[PDB]
Design a protein around this ligand. Structure first.
Ligand SMILES: CCCC(=O)Oc1ccc([N+](=O)[O-])cc1
Ligand SMILES: CCCC(=O)Oc1ccc([N+](=O)[O-])cc1
Length: 298
């Protein structure tokens, strides 16, 4: 199916120290937010004590609370880039459109922290949120969410939840990375030219993982886990022209066949990252998909 027209234009107009590349990634996100300002939203900064140190968070409070579970959101950026500010545009809209409290998490970035530190941190924040939820007038079961690398973290947290005594009501995976071991057709075919590229993904893995053997670890590659029974209800959103598409859709099919309530939505003509790119109407359509999915959770 053809590239979305606006996506095609964006790709057509596209043209370093670690610090410079981080700043560049942040300038890119600010630019998009200037083009399509986020909705106003009440927020409160805070810090969660985790097993790997303090982790900054931002709690988003909807104008009108309509959803009975807190969302815990883990930003993407290949485990190296991104923060609460880069993902504000998405989180503010999730909060106001769903009508949910959202905890946005500033987990520790690679290469300064390596696998599996961010996983641990993200588990700890999820547990904190479950504990706090009654004091917010909410159910203790949380919804975890993330894009890309953040979708990886949401998926892994979801797999660890029962063993970690963590009540999780649902998982929202936005074009997640899930399998660092296997080539898929999409990973081969869309490896260059669609914003997320092969060589970038290799580099991210080099920064995040301790050794190449870590690719086979289920906390890096959750798609490898043989038993998906009993995992939380899943919304899995993919982009058609995304190297990560195929592993996302395959994981959704495996969840479904393991009896997990699963909604799988591919946005045709779209690319990786579209849910933090408000120049595309499909970002808000996907956020509407989230609200409609969460309506069904109870
Ligand atoms: C937001 C982008 C997330 C991303 O590309 O994360 C990845 C990190 C490593 C691998 N890999 O080693 O294959 C893939 C994705
Ligand atoms: C996508 C695979 C990336 C990978 O193999 O990551 C690493 C490679 C080499 C080292 N190392 O030996 O330091 C660590 C991770």
């Amino acid at each position: 199916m053809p590239l979305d027209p606006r996506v095609e234009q964006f790709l057509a107009q596209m043209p370093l120290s670690l610090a410079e590349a981080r700043q560049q990634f942040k300038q890119g996100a600010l630019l998009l937010d200037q083009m399509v300002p986020p909705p106003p939203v009440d927020t409160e900064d805070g810090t969660v004590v985790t097993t790997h140190g303090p982790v900054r968070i931002r709690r988003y409070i909807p104008d009108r609370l309509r959803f009975s579970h807190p969302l815990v959101f883990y930003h993407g950026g290949g485990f190296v880039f991104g923060d609460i500010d880069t993902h504000h545009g998405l989180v503010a809209r999730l909060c106001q459109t769903v009508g949910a409290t959202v905890i946005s998490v500033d987990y520790s970035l690679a290469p300064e922290a390596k696998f599996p530190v961010p996983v641990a941190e993200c588990i700890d924040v999820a547990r904190w949120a479950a504990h706090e939820a009654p004091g917010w007038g909410l159910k203790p079961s949380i919804v975890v969410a993330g894009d890309s690398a953040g979708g990886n973290l949401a998926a892994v947290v979801s797999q660890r939840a029962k063993d970690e005594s963590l009540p999780i009501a649902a998982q929202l995976l936005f074009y997640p990375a899930l399998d660092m071991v296997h080539e898929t057709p999409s990973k081969r075919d869309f490896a260059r030219g669609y914003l997320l590229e092969a060589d970038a993904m290799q580099w991210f893995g080099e920064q995040y993982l301790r050794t190449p053997d870590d690719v086979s670890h289920p906390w890096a590659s959750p798609a490898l886990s043989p038993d998906l029974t009993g995992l939380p209800p899943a919304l899995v959103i993919t982009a058609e022209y995304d190297p990560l598409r195929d592993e996302g859709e395959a994981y959704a099919e495996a969840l479904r066949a393991a009896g997990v309530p699963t909604e799988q939505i591919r946005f045709d003509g779209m690319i990786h990252g579209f849910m933090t790119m408000p120049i595309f109407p499909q970002m808000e359509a996907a956020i509407e998909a989230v609200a409609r999915f969460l309506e069904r959770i109870d």
